[PDB]
Amino acid sequence: STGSATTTPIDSLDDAYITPVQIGTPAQTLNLDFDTGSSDLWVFSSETTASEVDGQTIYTPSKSTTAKLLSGATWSISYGDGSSSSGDVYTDTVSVGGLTVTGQAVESAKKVSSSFTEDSTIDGLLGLAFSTLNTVSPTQQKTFFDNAKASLDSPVFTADLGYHAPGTYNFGFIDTTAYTGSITYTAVSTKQGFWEWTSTGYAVGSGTFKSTSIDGIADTGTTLLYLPATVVSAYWAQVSGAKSSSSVGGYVFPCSATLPSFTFGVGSARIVIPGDYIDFGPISTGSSSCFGGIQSSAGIGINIFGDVALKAAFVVFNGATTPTLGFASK
């Protein structure tokens, strides 16, 4: 089997991407944030504290003839950005772009943190990291991909995120028309439960490539590109007036700037992030100070190849017995 679904930016900045997901019988369609940095499929629901729901579409398990309460199971997750959610668990039928899993754990939120409430466009998350990170207790549950894998034509999914435009998540096949040149594959460590890999280096604009190993995670659920402070400083030094602002929370730059591109290495291959991908707009409405899309990972504890990086590529998440990642230009 295969599946193919369009993923759409939630706003004009590509702050996140939503993909429609069918849950239950009859189908209840929710728009979920596909997150290769986590491993829980959780949804706003009829059980979510009412004051914490503000415009989201909810899953109502009592209206699904295929929903079954997973007795005794609870979940609770905290994300790198400080947000969190928790609740109980159903199993139900879940379909993405024509690919169906029966008995998928659907984690129903009883509580969500303010940032989730405040984002009306995201109805929940669909985790695509390794199932070892799944938070369901006392019996850990499998991700949608993990459940689908054996049925797929090939045990892979691909992320093709757009810049200011829709893109595609495919399951079970590689669309050879969706990228240019070749896909370069690179080793993955699953030891921390992430799609963790090592970039071979970087360049800023038309500058020379610096060969240096950068370990980090391919994370579709993180907006920006978080890299070591040395790398980030080298980038922003090429933008007149750019500075790191403790009050804002990272590098800012004059909105009148033309940003240079940023290149990262995948083996001997190179992915070029155009300068415009690195512009996240005014820090506050009407400001002429703009927020940068490349930020320091110092104090995160890990480098994160988030959407800023991934949207410059066609990305293969290869869930073979020994997982690997593939990157192509597009």
CATH of residue 112's domain is 2.40.70.10
Give the integer Cα–Cα distance in Å for 178 and 68.
38
Active-site residue, from 45, 64, 85, 199:
199
Quick one: 179 and 327 in the same domain?
A: yes
Residue 298 CB partners (closer than 8 Å, separation 6+): 228, 229
Quick one: 282 and 306 in the same domain?
A: yes
Query: Catalytic annotation on 199?
Result: yes
DSSP H helices, the chain, are: 114-117, 144-148, 229-236, 307-310
Give the integer Cα–Cα distance in Å for 261 and 277.
8
Q: Evaluate the CA torsion angle 27, 156, 174, 213 in order and state its sign.
A: positive
Active-site residue, from 35, 88, 119, 219:
35
Q: Is 92 helix (H, G, I), strand (E, B) or coil?
A: strand
The total number of structural domains in the chain stands at 2
| Tokens, residue 305 | 């190849």
DSSP state of 260: P
Quick one: 169 and 275 in the same domain?
A: no
Give the integer Cα–Cα distance in Å for 112 and 306.
23
Quick one: 328 and 315 in the same domain?
A: yes
Residue 132 CB partners (closer than 8 Å, separation 6+): 39, 140, 190, 193
One-character DSSP codes across 164-215: SS-EEEEES---TTSSSS-PEEEE-B-TTSS-EEEEEEEEETTSPPEEEEEE
Among 174, 191, 207, give the residue marking a domain's end: 174
Which strand (E) or helix (H) includes residue 38? none
The domain of 31 spans 5-174
Quick one: 135 and 184 in the same domain?
A: no
Prior bond of 155 cis (ω within 30°): no
Of the candidates 43, 329, 307, the one whose C-alpha atom is nearest the C-alpha of residue 164 is 307
> What letter represents residue 154's amino acid?
S
Give the integer Cα–Cα distance in Å for 309 and 219.
9
Among 146, 174, 202, give the residue marking a domain's end: 174
Among 125, 145, 174, give the residue marking a domain's end: 174
Quick one: 92 and 181 in the same domain?
A: no
Quick one: 52 and 97 in the same domain?
A: yes
Query: Catalytic annotation on 114?
Result: no
Quick one: 302 and 200 in the same domain?
A: yes
Quick one: 225 and 113 in the same domain?
A: no
